[PDB]
Amino acid sequence: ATLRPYLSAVRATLQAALCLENFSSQVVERHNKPEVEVRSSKELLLQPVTISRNEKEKVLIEGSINSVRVSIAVKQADEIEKILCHKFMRFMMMRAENFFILRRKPVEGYDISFLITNFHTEQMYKHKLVDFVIHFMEEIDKEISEMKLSVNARARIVAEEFLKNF
Amino acid sequence: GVVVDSGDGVTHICPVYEGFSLPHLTRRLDIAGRDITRYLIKLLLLRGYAFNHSADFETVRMIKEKLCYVGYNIEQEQKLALETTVLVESYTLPDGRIIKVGGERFEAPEALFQPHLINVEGVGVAELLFNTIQAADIDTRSEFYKHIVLSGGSTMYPGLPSRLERELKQLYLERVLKGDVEKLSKFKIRIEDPP
Amino acid sequence: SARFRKVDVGEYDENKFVDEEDAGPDEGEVDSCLRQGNMTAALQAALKNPPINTKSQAVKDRAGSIVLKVLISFKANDIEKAVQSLDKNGVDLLMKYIYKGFESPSDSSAVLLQWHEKALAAGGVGSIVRVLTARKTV
Amino acid sequence: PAYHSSLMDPDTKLIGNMALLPIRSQFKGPAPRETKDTDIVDEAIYYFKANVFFKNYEIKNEADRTLIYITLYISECLKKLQKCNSKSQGEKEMYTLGITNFPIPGEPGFPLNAIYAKPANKQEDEVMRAYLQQLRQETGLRLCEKVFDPQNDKPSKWWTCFVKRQFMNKSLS
Amino acid sequence: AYHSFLVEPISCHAWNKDRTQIAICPNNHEVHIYEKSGNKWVQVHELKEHNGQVTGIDWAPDSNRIVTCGTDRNAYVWTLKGRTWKPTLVILRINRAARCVRWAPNEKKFAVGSGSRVISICYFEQENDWWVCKHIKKPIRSTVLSLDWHPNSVLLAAGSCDFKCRIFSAYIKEVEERPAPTPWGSKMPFGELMFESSSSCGWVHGVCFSANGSRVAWVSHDSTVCLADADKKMAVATLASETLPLLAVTFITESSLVAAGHDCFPVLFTYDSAAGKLSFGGRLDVPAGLDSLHKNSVSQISVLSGGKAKCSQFCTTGMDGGMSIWDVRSLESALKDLKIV
Amino acid sequence: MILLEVNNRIIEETLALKFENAAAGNKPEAVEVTFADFDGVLYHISNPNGDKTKVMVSISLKFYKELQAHGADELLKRVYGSYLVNPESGYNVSLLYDLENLPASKDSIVHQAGMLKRNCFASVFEKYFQFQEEGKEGENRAVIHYRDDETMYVESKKDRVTVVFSTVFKDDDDVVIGKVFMQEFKEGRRASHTAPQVLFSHREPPTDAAVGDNIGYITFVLFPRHTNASARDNTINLIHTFRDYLHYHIKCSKAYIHTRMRAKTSDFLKVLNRARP
Amino acid sequence: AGRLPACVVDCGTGYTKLGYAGNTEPQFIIPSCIAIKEMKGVDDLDFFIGDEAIEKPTYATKWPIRHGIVEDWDLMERFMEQVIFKYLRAEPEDHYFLLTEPPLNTPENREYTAEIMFESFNVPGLYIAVQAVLALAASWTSRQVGERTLTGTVIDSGDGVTHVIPVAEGYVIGSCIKHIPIAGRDITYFIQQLLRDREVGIPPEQSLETAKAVKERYSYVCPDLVKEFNKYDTDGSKWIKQYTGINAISKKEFSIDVGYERFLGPEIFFHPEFANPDFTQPISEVVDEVIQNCPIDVRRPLYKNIVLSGGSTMFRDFGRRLQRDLKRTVDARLKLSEELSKPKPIDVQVITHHMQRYAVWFGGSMLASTPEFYQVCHTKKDYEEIGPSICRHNPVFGV
């Protein structure tokens, strides 16, 4: 219902925020670092913005001269989704070294966070990375529902297989 | 000025006035090259890689030499290692196996600034320099601080100079300015990195 | 000894950056045109005189809601029309406000996603870029 | 490693590069006369079952060339002897198979040409052609009073099996 | 007309006098020089000496000397000693990364914006036989991205992360004579601040001086293009773009600007001195997954022939490893409505 | 494997290999084996006195007393007769087997030895099943502490017998998944109405049976058709493996979800890696 | 240590040995395979492991533990569900676990293992041991050593492949490991082939089996080949054994004479060229090499403590042969250092002990019995605060 207008608005912003370049450090002799992370040079940091669907769903984009940090707040109506989302997000973060645009830990208040740097936009079509984050916001909700049905689908088969042997 | 020469052998903070050197002021630190290569090894172990101290030393030297650096703000270099993957770099070993390096890139050299990390007693190169210069005629001070030259294979760590300049600017604001912030702006430290 | 490090000497480093810092629409004319079936006017009403410089949050927050109130009080097939009666300066400001309303989700974040959509066709992706670059926003 | 010969004397005549090792036999040939109990042909037959399994054999003496020759030939007899029915019958098969002229060094067909020297002239070519058939004859019969079971008409399947294996993967055929 | 030299970004490029060779930094710690043979490109030189990533290259046409600035805080002057090039270390006295370099029209000196928040100016002193430099520091409060000398080898435009486009004076009396008046002003002592844009938004990615040097334009990260006319009281005209920020710009005539950037394709702007008003002239790259010639962001554009006065051929390079070459005339025939100047 | 086996494989496979060797006539092997079974059970298999021709199989249950007080000892003898002997120092029950005096068809002594653990429980259920089958109501309830922090409450009534576990899901997570499974159980009568009605209760018991964030009260309700002699044995084989069944399946889910998350993340690692040139 | 003992799982190439700690042998020993149907409903559970899975009709037989190609976690995880809830019948939440890992197992794997053990199964403790090391501990039992240590050359040979592995004080000198293309599988094929060229009437299918049976019933390592063939050809009665199987088809009995292969099989370990064109280096050299590409200062402590491990180290006189060979190589070397001058004799000693077939599982059983084990072992809490990362390092302990 309200999903296309939400993602289309986040796609726009992800395009605006993902224009960056290599930037050596002003603060440290021969160091290069995600300015949106360290944050030791305010002029190099863009304004943080937020796109919100409802009161629970929203994305946080924090730009910088050489890196963006996106934090998504996934959907969760009941307690089974809540733990499913949670185990899932942590599953990926644990493998962040292979999912290189993923940030090991979220950002206080968010279920998951990406950290796209210039070295990424340099080695990958940035219009795609913007696709993939929109494709992620779409696929993580579909997967959380499969899992939710998977659990029930078996919770019942497992109860009938026992209750029927009496 | 003061030549902070450190190689694969040992660290030295030897001051020099107009003519030659003033031995009574030159000091030592028990943390050189070999001492940072090992702490790396002992650091790559806690990560999942077991290298033989007497058989992979040479291979870990290069790893250090290639990915090791001095952190500037350790509290910030930690959030980068823990909260993100930006510091992680791959490295192919001689046999072909491909390992990873991260936090242990900056942690291995941090010994120079916290000797205890490798259980050695001292105050660490930086806090050692500051003392070697206050231990000189106040009227020969301005010169030294204005002239600190780094030499030795173990002084080429990316960000080394920027750390000293921060360490010193720290030791000053406290032990020579008693915490008076409104006068640090007057402290001029020039640490040159002569190629 | 590991005490001298508790202090950030970079704070006072004379070679640091700082902006050159230093007043809100008139409710009346806003609510006046609003309550009169003249929304395309109310929008132009609010968008006039943004608190871009008021060092206060309470103030910037005031204009935020006046605009916030003008956008929500719009019909579906009504936004676009009034979006196109605004110069680039207008659009660019609206888009600025639209990302302010995004921080107060209120049963409103679906209507804004409509505004954003319209203002995006008019202002382009550049009007969003200018919202991220502003060093003096609402 | 593979089994080497130990008959190398501080003065053993040489036909080409192959050691002209003494053997006890009644066939005609340049082969000297042995005074000791065993000869290079025995030594070859004793080591066969082992050597045959080796792909690589280091030539250490002019003596190993011969040992290697005899060995390769032995597998040739087991090829033949595999299909016959009596010690009396084989005693004849090992006569022909021994008279036939198998490719010698220098010739196309004789494997290991990179190891064996070709006769340096018509005389050697005749001597070496003799001191070879002589060995194909003695090593020829001696293989019979072994291969065949005391119960004639029985080629001991304990030799029949090595018929499919080639020493150093080479073959005089 | 595109050509890929690699898939990794081209850091910076600098053609020689003839436009017979091109020098590039393949996101590497070195510079690669390509010559053209027929319609095939052929690497002819590898300039290795830097110990950091090269950030800028500039070729001195008549003297045929190359100057390169790294992240290793150094700068080298490359001289062709017959067959190969020997570098010479130039101490810029900085503690951060060199970010861009430009030789002055007179090839007597080169500028070097940097992270130490200071521009450097160097010149050779045949007295002691080595280079030296003086710094233009105030009022520079951040990293210096782009530089562009004025035709008189004295004024210098500078764009920096502190959101400002500035014109300075690099007047070094020890190598050139007193500067003559300029609409920008008559007082031109070393480091003098002649002009400064009045914006607090967007970083200044690129700055360009007009052919007659009385007009300077710059591109900021707020997706705006700007031009200040020295013959109108330095009154600045601004165009609010509707797409992504530009990272490079150059004049192709006295009233025509061409800028490429994050949209990966070059566009055209035309200044109407009458009303002191800039305007969008349209896209010039008109038809992976992109409909643009370049695949990644275009980060440097230079004039290949016809100077900034009447440009006929300009060239662009980007992070996609590709170097394009455009034809101002061809583009005019491909787009009826393309109204240059 | 949906249901958990009741027979304990190490007991059967250890005996079977010793009887086999005894029959074939080989010189007997020394055997010493320690191992366990669900719910804190510990087993031991050894040669008393070092008599390699004698093989003992003793079981240990911290809650034996509670079982003993309900017919355990009695029933255990009826079932193992002369194989039963004085319990080993450390365990409550012991079975002995002379390797020189084995029956004809060993297959049933081996089968029953593996059912050892199950047999000590069979008592308390068989008991209360009888009460119901006689009408002897009001009888107090058995209270077996099968786990340090868990309890089963059996007790009979006129027309129905009730077993009530009070299990504990460690991980705050498991409580969530758990409720899913229990919901299906409380609705099982829609797939098998001639089955034990089931009930559930979160954090609080339906004495002072602990209340906690991670505690739940599953309450089966057996009916004659399950508690009678015709059924009885089967009903006990299920009902006593329940608690372990539930946790077995709550963990098998989590492992399933993992295989999902694996492939889903492998998908994501594909889209991702295709943005590269 | 509580009332219950720790579970000890040693997943190998073809065989997974498991059981509780303290015991001198594994309660179970099964084929490292799992069979499945190739998931909605509960089909994930519909599988089998070990023996119960080698030929399951409507089922697919996998073998996820291979020295060769990528590991399957979906499978590995299941195979553990049964290893736990069916074979050891152990409530996981109540036992510590000691799993093993091959040499060079990457740190990432451990985190995965641990992601499974702690999040799926909830084990309150875990410790990842390294096979080659436990096998070293397992040799302490040997009455050849009354002096412990974790510094030695572990020559492990199972069915898949053989590894000559050096170890300096509990740590595998990874960069010096050498592999050998000779193991059980090869000795079998070879013996198999030697039978085809001689024996008659062996059921083409049961061909492999008769071989595997000959290998395990009559194979051994001899000191010399000419002398062995001699013995056999002379006193033929004394040596030629006899085998008789049952034709799986015509349900008829077939007889054959087991001959040369008895000693010729295990001989491929010392003359690989006998049945492998590519390889040729005698296992004794490989071991010489490995200790030479090792820290000079720790070579002697590697030559005096070569610990056999693995079913294929069993052939009667394997060590006696290995050690004579090694000693001849090493001694001949130092003999020339004199013919170019006289060093100090090198002490080469190969260790054979009663627990070789399952050395690895033995050592892991013994070590998980000590109290010291419960200390150098990562716990539940430690995991729910520092996470997976911890299981990357496992403190060596014992010495």
Ligand SMILES: COc1ccc(N2C(=O)CS[C@H]2c2cccc(Br)c2)c(OC)c1
């Ligand atoms: C090839 O499939 C495997 C992948 C990984 C491992 N293991 C590890 O990486 C850590 S210890 C071992 C293992 C052993 C048993 C269960 C589990 Br889960 C993991 C494993 O055991 C050697 C097999």
